[PDB]
Amino acid sequence: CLGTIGPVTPLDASDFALDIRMPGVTPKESDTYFCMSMRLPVDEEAFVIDFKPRASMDTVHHMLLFGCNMPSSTGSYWFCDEGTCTDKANILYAWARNAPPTRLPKGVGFRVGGETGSKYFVLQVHYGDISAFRDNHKDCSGVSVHLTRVPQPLIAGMYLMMSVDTVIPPGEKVVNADISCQYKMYPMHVFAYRVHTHHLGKVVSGYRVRNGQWTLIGRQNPQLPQAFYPVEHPVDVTFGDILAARCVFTGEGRTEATHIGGTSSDEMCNLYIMYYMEAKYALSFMTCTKNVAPDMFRTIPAEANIP
């Protein structure tokens, strides 16, 4: 816990570290999601060029940091059952125990603040085993974020791919959630990926399709720590390519149909593609919910079907 010196640490003339911590929380039941927000100190446009995790190695499972203009609650801390942000939450950072977080390359920063950038950070901390709190303890875990107002030559962004209409029948052995959009912006370069799914998902796979050629971006089992994993060969996606993604679900162990939604008993098929772009061509966020080329999913690498 910080104390009398507050959450802002000045680094030089135009740099500062902003500590985003929990306000000394104490959970009640096993598996709890706490969320809290931080207005940015600056109104001027700024660049998040670094994150440092400040979490206890014996109690925290995962951490998530978002940028949005309308956080879910105004309270000091809240339960993320009430969601994270009313508007679209732009994910900036993830932390996992078993997955050592990769760093942002130098000259690459998330554009925040200003006219159009995010006005708030929302921190989400998952406390798995509460039995690690023999007493009240009072926990102030969170993220330290490096801000600079020096324009970065490369701007980081997120290309989010998600399913909306996926319906998983009870006991059905395999249900695919296919997603596809054509890319219509300037080149992006993918360097990290994150997959998200609930308890029913078996595998999530992301590709770039160019002239009918499937180029792997990320392939992960979603039941493993859902951190940001680095891409092996850095992939460029350019005007004309089709981004395709498939989550493989199963309906086994369910009495009723499962669809896409917020609750634990609902499902999700998310692939977060963290890219970078030349600052002057850059846009911070892109989204695909469509499946514009379903016929294309015929020539999908078989590897995207087996676990």
Taking CB under 5 A as the rule, does residue 236 contact Ni ion? Answer: yes
Q: Is 199 annotated as a binding residue?
A: no
Q: Which of 158, 162, 188, 196 is catalytic?
A: 196
* Residue 146 designated active-site: no
Rounded to 5 degrees, φ, ψ at 10 are -70, 130
Q: Is 196 annotated as a binding residue?
A: yes
* Residue 126 designated active-site: yes
Report, in Å, the least distance between residue 233 CB and Na ion: 27
Give the Cα separation of 280 and 140 in Å (integer): 38
Q: Please choose which of Cu ion, Na ion, Ni ion, none residue 80 contacts, taking the beta carbon within 5 to 8 angstroms, the exact cut-off set by kind.
A: Na ion
Q: Which of 63, 161, 268, 286 is catalytic?
A: 268
Shorter beta-carbon distance to Cu ion: residue 193 or 214: 193
Taking CB under 5 A as the rule, does residue 122 contact Na ion? Answer: no
Taking CB under 5 A as the rule, does residue 278 contact Ni ion? Answer: no
Nearest to 141 by CA among 127, 128, 157: 127
* Cα 78–chain centre separation: 19
Q: How far from 28 is each of 31, 33, 80, 263, CA to CA, in Å?
A: 9, 11, 14, 19
* Residue 198 designated active-site: yes
Q: Is 61 annotated as a binding residue?
A: yes
Between the two ends of the chain, the Cα-to-Cα distance in Å is 42
79 near 33, Cβ under 8 Å? yes
Shorter beta-carbon distance to Ni ion: residue 89 or 188: 188
Q: Is 62 annotated as a binding residue?
A: yes
Residues 19-78 within binding reach of Cu ion (CB under 5 A): 61-62
147 near 87, Cβ under 8 Å? no
* Residue 61 designated active-site: yes
* Residue 220 designated active-site: no
Q: Please choose which of Na ion, Ni ion, Cu ion, none residue 178 contacts, taking the beta carbon within 5 to 8 angstroms, the exact cut-off set by kind.
A: none
Burial 20-29 (b: 16+ CB within 10 A, else e): bbbeebebee
Which helix (H) or strand (E) is 127 found in, with range?
Answer: strand 120-127
Q: Please choose which of Cu ion, Ni ion, Na ion, none residue 268 contacts, taking the beta carbon within 5 to 8 angstroms, the exact cut-off set by kind.
A: Cu ion
Give the Cα separation of 285 and 250 in Å (integer): 30
The amino acid occupying position 50 is D
Residues that contact Cu ion, how many (by CB under 5 A): 4
238 near 159, Cβ under 8 Å? no
Report, in Å, the least distance between residue 76 CB and Cu ion: 22
The CB-nearest residue to Ni ion is 236
Q: Which of 124, 152, 220, 226 is catalytic?
A: 124
Give the Cα separation of 258 and 1 in Å (integer): 41
Residue 89 burial (10 A CB sphere; 0-12, 13-18, 19+): buried
Q: Is 259 annotated as a binding residue?
A: no
Q: Please choose which of Cu ion, Ni ion, Na ion, none residue 253 contacts, taking the beta carbon within 5 to 8 angstroms, the exact cut-off set by kind.
A: Na ion
* Residue 259 designated active-site: no
Q: Is 233 annotated as a binding residue?
A: no
Contacts with Cu ion by CB under 5 A lie at 61-62, 126, 268
Contacts with Na ion by CB under 5 A lie at 50, 80, 146, 253
Per the annotation, binding residues are: 61-62, 126, 196, 198, 268
Active-site amino acid positions: 61-62, 124, 126, 196, 198, 268
